Write a protein that binds this DNA or RNA. Structure first.
Ligand SMILES: [Mg+2]
Ligand SMILES: [Mg+2]
Length: 132
DNA sequence: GATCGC
DNA sequence: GCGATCGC
């Protein structure tokens, strides 16, 4: 029974970025996690990490700035709290959306709802990070 | 099994 | 609950 199943409260300050944040997502560390987003949710006791994610994208959807750079089809996803798709070259088979990755692995004392520890990646990066 | 998503 | 991918 993993620590991302059982409930917990949101913690973290975030990081400053632009509306062109998802290049770094395919690159190294990844894209950061927005501080507008962080503040919007700091200290909300969430039921599961599935509950948290919905609340992250849904706030991206209510955010006119970060949604600005998504097509009419991804503004939808986030508008119901779903991850938007990545570009095809960044996808791996049937793993197609952006993925919220625990920078420090949870098993090594990485905290689940530690927004400062969450980085955003394309599947192709997410795999490579977990190798190189 | 680990760690991401619906 | 279910589906995906990597696996040294
Ligand atoms: Mg990982
Ligand atoms: Mg298995």
């Amino acid at each position: 029974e993993s620590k991302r199943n059982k409930p917990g409260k949101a913690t973290g300050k975030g990081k400053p970025v632009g509306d062109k944040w998802l290049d770094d997502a395919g690159k190294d560390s990844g894209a950061p996690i927005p501080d507008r987003i962080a503040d919007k949710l700091r200290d909300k006791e969430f039921k599961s990490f599935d509950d948290f994610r919905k609340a992250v994208w849904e706030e991206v959807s209510k955010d006119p700035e970060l949604s600005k750079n998504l097509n009419p089809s991804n503004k939808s996803s986030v508008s119901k709290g779903y991850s938007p798709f990545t570009p095809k070259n960044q996808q791996v088979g049937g793993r197609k959306v952006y993925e919220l990755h625990a920078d420090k692995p949870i098993s090594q004392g990485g905290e689940v709802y530690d927004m400062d520890n969450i980085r955003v990646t394309t599947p192709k990066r997410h795999i490579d990070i977990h190798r190189g």
